[PDB]
Structure 1
Amino acid sequence: MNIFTTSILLIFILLLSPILISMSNLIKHINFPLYTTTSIKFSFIISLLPLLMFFHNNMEYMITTWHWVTMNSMELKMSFKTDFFSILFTSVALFVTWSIMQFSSWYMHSDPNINRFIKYLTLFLITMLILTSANNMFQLFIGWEGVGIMSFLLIGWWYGRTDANTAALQAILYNRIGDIGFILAMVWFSLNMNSWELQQIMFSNNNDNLIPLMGLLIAATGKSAQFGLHPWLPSAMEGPTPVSALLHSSTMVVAGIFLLVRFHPLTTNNNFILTTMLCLGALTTLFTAICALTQNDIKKIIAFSTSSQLGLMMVTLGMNQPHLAFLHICTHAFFKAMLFMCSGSIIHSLADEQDIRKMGNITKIMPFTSSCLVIGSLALTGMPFLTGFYSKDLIIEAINTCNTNAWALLITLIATSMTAMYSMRIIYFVTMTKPRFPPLISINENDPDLMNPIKRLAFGSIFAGFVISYNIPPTSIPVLTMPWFLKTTALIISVLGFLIALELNNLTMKLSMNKANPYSSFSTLLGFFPSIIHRITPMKSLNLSLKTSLTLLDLIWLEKTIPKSTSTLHTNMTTLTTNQKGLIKLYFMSFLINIILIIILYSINL
């Protein structure tokens, strides 16, 4: 059905159209923000047409558009897969993007370079979708590196600020450590089984496939902020709030989760790596969640929640439940996008206050965002019959029913209670409290560009879990049979998580000094992984270059040995041979010596 193929190729052409308009002189004459917002809107509708096809018939398509090099045995070609993962994600991503660009127009209003900002956002979407629908992994690499570079360009939008520059260099470094893993997996699949195309890599099921998948797991940990190198996604919040929503919140981070689902036919074979990520996903879930409890920056708390939810997503991939992991990716995108832009509304409406400490009683001052915030908060806490509930409790009870690390099982559940706690922290401090913001009040959220997108995503946050769960193809053969406390565990832990936190928030109001526990600061400064591993490594990696590798072995030792020594050896030799009295007697005698030696040279060799 060409309608299907053409549609998958068409979304890319339509989104690329804003990019070249800015290359020509035409954008000055038309409005770039409005034009870009409309075309993503049309791209979402175009994406819907294949989505219905798949659902009606559940069929996939590998599209080989252009050949790039034969390179002898390994031919390289540009291929877009249209498997359930690719088209489901393509639709969810553009809806979020359509929401954010309209938010972007309101948020960055008064920025002198709005058009460039919108331009990079769509370039990000083009790389993100290429990363999504990539058959051969070389294209997956183009997407993997591609979102990394544009994140660097967009985290540090305001280049002047060194803090933004530091975060951008952070993000590239963590991504590049991840890139080493993908290169290793690529190289292993460029040798052994031989083609970077997924359709053939999957014929490596009954092989070792550990050297390679360990590489992809390493790539995922860097891209998805698992416990190892978890800090750049918190650091990424130095970016503009809309950038934080579409890339820090949904498309960029889920890329690591998406890669492993693409390669899970191979993942099911190796038991060792499955528990490895189950284990690290589990550690990141709580580690990030505990850090979020004391963080006093609204954007920071949401970002930690982005990492904690993906930690749960990592856990399901680790328990070899790929389809549900993808289901959470889609539902995760709707609500996290909402909460960020919700805080975008609060931060912009207030005098750019990004701290929960000075922000209060937004519920009465701004009901529209507060309503959106609590809708999102409950979805994050898996309120029954909301989008989180359809996918999240499936994952929870999956854990409660599988054979798993006891430590992983316990931490994931309390991680769920903490998600309720920090969710409670945000609404109590941000919304339900006496106002503490600066005295002059100038709040307006009436702008259509704020409401509309927030309104549209809110509709998605309310109904998406209903629609996606029923429509997707039956998969995974879930276990609905459980003792009732395990069946209802997700619901109860979420309930008491808020209950306990509400007790905490309530406690503070008293005139009695509590401050915080000794491990509280440990929590507030991010587990101290940032304070220690960011000051030692960059210090003992640069000291060795300047002091040891550059100046010691370079410069002096490699210049005194080869280039300089040969300089000296000769210099000294000329000094002895050319220091001559000039007297004839001396010189002549030397002629005598010569005659003698030559007489002998003949004599002995007679």
Structure 2
Amino acid sequence: MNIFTTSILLIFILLLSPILISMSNLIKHINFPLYTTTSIKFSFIISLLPLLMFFHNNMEYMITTWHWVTMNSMELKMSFKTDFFSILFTSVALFVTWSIMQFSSWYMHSDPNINRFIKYLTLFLITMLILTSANNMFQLFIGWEGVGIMSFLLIGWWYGRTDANTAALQAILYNRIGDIGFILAMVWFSLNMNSWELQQIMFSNNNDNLIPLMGLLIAATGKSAQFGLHPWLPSAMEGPTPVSALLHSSTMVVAGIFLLVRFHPLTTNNNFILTTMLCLGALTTLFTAICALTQNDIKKIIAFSTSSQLGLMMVTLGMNQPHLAFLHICTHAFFKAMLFMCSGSIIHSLADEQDIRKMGNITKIMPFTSSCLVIGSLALTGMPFLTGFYSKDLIIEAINTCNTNAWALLITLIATSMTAMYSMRIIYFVTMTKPRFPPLISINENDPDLMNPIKRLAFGSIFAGFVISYNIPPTSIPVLTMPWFLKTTALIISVLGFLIALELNNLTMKLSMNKANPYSSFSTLLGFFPSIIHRITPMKSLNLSLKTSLTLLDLIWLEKTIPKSTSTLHTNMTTLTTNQKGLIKLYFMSFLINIILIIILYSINL
């Protein structure tokens, strides 16, 4: 049909209109952030229509809008896979991006080049919608690398400080360590299947796709940050908070797990891939959760929350239940956006200070922000009817109703408890205790570019999971016949984590000199994984790159072997040759020697 395709293409066209007008002379004479915000709003309103059509008929179109080039039986062409996942992610991303745009018009004033910030956000969203709607894999890689660079540029927004740049280069490094596996998979599918489109890769379903799936594992490990490549995500907080909320908690951090969701029919048959996904995701969900404990910066706490819930989603892909992982994507979006925007309100209200030890009594001095933040934290936990239930309940139900691995189950349960714990930690140290902030109070929660976006995300975080779950078509069959201590295990364990954190954060109010531990620093520091690896691995790399590469091969030994040997040989032959003295006696003696050699050669050869 025309309506469906027309709307899909019109979304991208609307999103490109701001980038067009930015390269014009019309950024002046208008208000560019409002124009962009309105473009995102109209794009969302248009994207609703494909969503309703799909919920009605469930058709999963496929478009090939433009042919690019043929390469000996390989038609590279722009083509979109407009399935369930694409539409449901497009709508959600546009919602969150509209809200983040209003916020980033409130926040980020005091910046003259705010329009550059807005343009970069639009470009990230465009690369994300390319990555998310793709049918090929070259197009998907375009969006992949686009997300990567956009994160480099937005993390490194304030290009004066030499920590944002380190964060950006770090992100780039880990994303490339993922892109190795991406390119490995792309190479394998090109060589064997002679194509990059999913419609052919689906015919590899019984073909021992081990190493391409390992490549996709590495790719999503790097992008949707997991343990082996985890550090870049909390380090991607030196950038502004709307950057964090939009990219590093909803979209760039979900690219790779979306990719694994899009390759689920190949994983049904490989069990080793499932097993390693399970163990790796569980490791992340434990590690980042216990590391969020004993953190003072809010932004890092939300980063580790993202990593933990993302490990839970990779745990879900560890079994044949990817659609539930995608529901958790679409629901996690609202929580993280709201949390980061409440954090940014709390921050920009007072000075740039982001640490809960100087935040104080926010239930009373900011009722709106506290209300929304508590709603978001409760929904992040498995609260029974706020869009965290409608995934997480089914998640834990599935994982304690499956026969895979017991340590993964156990540490995921502990990690859910820890989710309750650090949510309670924020709610205590930020929202309940007495004021620790400085005494000049300059709070202003009243701005319609602030309250309306978090209000929209709150209606989201209360209603959208209900709506989605009761509108989507049924897939990924659920199991529900089981004892009571498995249907209420997430609720129980979240409540119990809340209780423990309440008690333990009350324990600090009394007077007793607490001490450091071998624990509490493996959490405060990140298992010392940064503090070791980031200063040995580059050390040996760079030392081996100067010596043993430049000043050992190229500058001494390749000069001593090939050119300088030649020079010394020819000049030494010159010296022993042409250092003659002007005496005809010796010349004529040599002439006689030549006479003798010529006659001897004649007598011999003959």
User: Shorter-chain-normalised TM-score: which range?
Assistant: over 0.9
Where structure 1 has 5 or more consecutive residues not aligned to the other structure, the ranges are: none
Q: What is the alpha-carbon distance in structure 1 between the residues aligned to residue 199 and residue 146 of structure 2?
A: 23
The alpha carbon displacement at 1:76 in A equals: 0.4
Q: Deviations over 1:190-217 (max 9, x none)?
A: 1111101111111100101111111001
The alpha carbon displacement at 1:517 in A equals: 3.0
**Alignment partner, residue 45 of structure 2:** 45
What pairs with 1:88-103 in structure 2 (closer than 5 Å)? 88-103=88-103
Q: Deviations over 1:116-165 (max 9, x none)?
A: 00000000000001000000000010011110011101111001111101
The alpha carbon displacement at 1:493 in A equals: 0.2
Q: What is the alpha-carbon distance in structure 2 between the residues aligned to residue 600 and residue 453 of structure 1?
A: 106
The alpha carbon displacement at 1:572 in A equals: 0.6
Q: What is the alpha-carbon distance in structure 2 between the residues aligned to residue 469 and residue 327 of structure 1?
A: 8
SS at match of 1:571: helix
Alignment partner of 1:574 is 2:574: yes
SS at match of 2:74: coil
Q: What is the alpha-carbon distance in structure 2 between the residues aligned to residue 314 and residue 224 of structure 1?
A: 9
**Alignment partner, residue 151 of structure 2:** 151
The alpha carbon displacement at 1:550 in A equals: 1.0
The alpha carbon displacement at 1:343 in A equals: 0.2
Q: What is the alpha-carbon distance in structure 2 between the residues aligned to residue 439 and residue 585 of structure 1?
A: 108
What pairs with 1:474-513 in structure 2 (closer than 5 Å)? 474-513=474-513
SS at match of 2:163: helix
Q: Give the fraction of aligned pairs with identical amino acids, expressed as a percent.
A: 100
Q: What is the alpha-carbon distance in structure 2 between the residues aligned to residue 478 and residue 422 of structure 1?
A: 30
Q: Deviations over 1:466-496 (max 9, x none)?
A: 1111011101110011110011100000000
SS at match of 2:388: helix
The alpha carbon displacement at 1:382 in A equals: 1.3
Normalised by the length of structure 1, the TM-score is: 0.99
Q: What is the alpha-carbon distance in structure 1 between the residues aligned to residue 461 and residue 191 of structure 2?
A: 45
The alpha carbon displacement at 1:110 in A equals: 1.6
Q: What is the alpha-carbon distance in structure 2 between the residues aligned to residue 602 and residue 422 of structure 1?
A: 102
Q: Deviations over 1:475-525 (max 9, x none)?
A: 111001111001110000000001001001100000112234321111101
Higher mean C-alpha displacement, 215-224 vs 23-32: 23-32
Q: What is the alpha-carbon distance in structure 2 between the residues aligned to residue 46 and residue 242 of structure 1?
A: 24
Q: What is the alpha-carbon distance in structure 2 between the residues aligned to residue 528 and residue 320 of structure 1?
A: 34
**Alignment partner, residue 562 of structure 2:** 562
Q: What is the alpha-carbon distance in structure 2 between the residues aligned to residue 68 and residue 603 of structure 1?
A: 78
**Alignment partner, residue 76 of structure 2:** 76
Q: What is the alpha-carbon distance in structure 2 between the residues aligned to residue 199 and residue 338 of structure 1?
A: 37
Q: Deviations over 1:36-72 (max 9, x none)?
A: 0000000001110000000001111110000111111
Q: What is the alpha-carbon distance in structure 2 between the residues aligned to residue 495 and residue 516 of structure 1?
A: 28
Q: Deviations over 1:392-417 (max 9, x none)?
A: 11001110010121111100000000
SS at match of 2:444: coil
Q: Deviations over 1:443-471 (max 9, x none)?
A: 01100001010111111011111111101
Q: What is the alpha-carbon distance in structure 1 between the residues aligned to residue 161 and residue 399 of structure 2?
A: 44
Q: Deviations over 1:543-598 (max 9, x none)?
A: 00011111101110111100111111101110100111221111111101111111
User: Any runs of at least 4 consecutive aligned residues in structure 1 with deviations exceeding 6 A, and if so which?
Assistant: none
Higher mean C-alpha displacement, 577-586 vs 215-224: 577-586
Q: Deviations over 1:1-22 (max 9, x none)?
A: 2110111111011001100100
SS at match of 1:450: helix
Higher mean C-alpha displacement, 512-521 vs 418-427: 512-521
SS at match of 1:390: helix
Q: Deviations over 1:159-205 (max 9, x none)?
A: 11111011000000000000111000000011111101111111100
SS at match of 1:431: coil
Q: What is the alpha-carbon distance in structure 2 between the residues aligned to residue 462 and residue 557 of structure 1?
A: 69
Q: Deviations over 1:254-304 (max 9, x none)?
A: 101100011111111111111111110000000010000111101110111
Where structure 2 has 5 or more consecutive residues not aligned to the other structure, the ranges are: none
The alpha carbon displacement at 1:439 in A equals: 1.1
Q: What is the alpha-carbon distance in structure 1 between the residues aligned to residue 584 and residue 170 of structure 2?
A: 76
Alignment partner of 1:549 is 2:549: yes
SS at match of 1:592: helix
Q: What is the alpha-carbon distance in structure 2 between the residues aligned to residue 71 and residue 508 of structure 1?
A: 68
SS at match of 2:66: strand
SS at match of 1:207: coil
Quick one: structure 1 residues 499 and 516, their matched pair in 2 at CA, closer, same or farther if it must change by over 3 Å? farther
Q: Deviations over 1:363-396 (max 9, x none)?
A: 1000000000000000111111111011111001
Q: Deviations over 1:408-437 (max 9, x none)?
A: 110000000000001111110011110100
SS at match of 1:237: coil
Q: What is the alpha-carbon distance in structure 2 between the residues aligned to residue 360 and residue 213 of structure 1?
A: 48
Q: What is the alpha-carbon distance in structure 1 between the residues aligned to residue 482 and residue 338 of structure 2?
A: 33
* Larger fraction in helix: 1
**Alignment partner, residue 357 of structure 1:** 357
Higher mean C-alpha displacement, 517-526 vs 290-299: 517-526
Q: What is the alpha-carbon distance in structure 1 between the residues aligned to residue 84 and residue 453 of structure 2?
A: 26
Q: What is the alpha-carbon distance in structure 1 between the residues aligned to residue 600 and residue 14 of structure 2?
A: 95
What pairs with 1:364-513 in structure 2 (closer than 5 Å)? 364-513=364-513
The alpha carbon displacement at 1:83 in A equals: 0.7
Q: What is the alpha-carbon distance in structure 2 between the residues aligned to residue 533 and residue 290 of structure 1?
A: 20
SS at match of 1:453: helix
**Alignment partner, residue 134 of structure 2:** 134
Q: What is the alpha-carbon distance in structure 2 between the residues aligned to residue 308 and residue 442 of structure 1?
A: 35
Q: What is the alpha-carbon distance in structure 1 between the residues aligned to residue 531 and residue 320 of structure 2?
A: 35
Q: What is the alpha-carbon distance in structure 2 between the residues aligned to residue 373 and residue 382 of structure 1?
A: 15
**Alignment partner, residue 225 of structure 2:** 225
Q: Deviations over 1:313-356 (max 9, x none)?
A: 11001112111000000000011111011101101111111011
Q: What is the alpha-carbon distance in structure 2 between the residues aligned to residue 360 and residue 72 of structure 1?
A: 66
Q: What is the alpha-carbon distance in structure 2 between the residues aligned to residue 432 and residue 382 of structure 1?
A: 22
**Alignment partner, residue 308 of structure 1:** 308
SS at match of 2:384: coil
Higher mean C-alpha displacement, 596-605 vs 173-182: 596-605
Q: What is the alpha-carbon distance in structure 2 between the residues aligned to residue 438 and residue 220 of structure 1?
A: 43
Q: What is the alpha-carbon distance in structure 2 between the residues aligned to residue 30 and residue 109 of structure 1?
A: 16
Q: What is the alpha-carbon distance in structure 1 between the residues aligned to residue 343 and residue 187 of structure 2?
A: 43
Q: What is the alpha-carbon distance in structure 2 between the residues aligned to residue 452 and residue 374 of structure 1?
A: 17
The alpha carbon displacement at 1:602 in A equals: 1.4
Q: What is the alpha-carbon distance in structure 2 between the residues aligned to residue 287 and residue 589 of structure 1?
A: 91
SS at match of 1:479: coil
The alpha carbon displacement at 1:218 in A equals: 0.5
SS at match of 2:400: helix
Q: What is the alpha-carbon distance in structure 1 between the residues aligned to residue 310 and residue 603 of structure 2?
A: 92
**Alignment partner, residue 204 of structure 1:** 204
Q: What is the alpha-carbon distance in structure 2 between the residues aligned to residue 202 and residue 513 of structure 1?
A: 62
Q: What is the alpha-carbon distance in structure 2 between the residues aligned to residue 570 and residue 208 of structure 1?
A: 61
SS at match of 2:521: helix
SS at match of 1:63: strand
Q: What is the alpha-carbon distance in structure 2 between the residues aligned to residue 571 and residue 29 of structure 1?
A: 74
SS at match of 1:523: coil
Q: What is the alpha-carbon distance in structure 1 between the residues aligned to residue 259 and residue 379 of structure 2?
A: 25
Q: Deviations over 1:525-550 (max 9, x none)?
A: 11111110111001110000011111
Q: What is the alpha-carbon distance in structure 2 between the residues aligned to residue 535 and residue 37 of structure 1?
A: 42
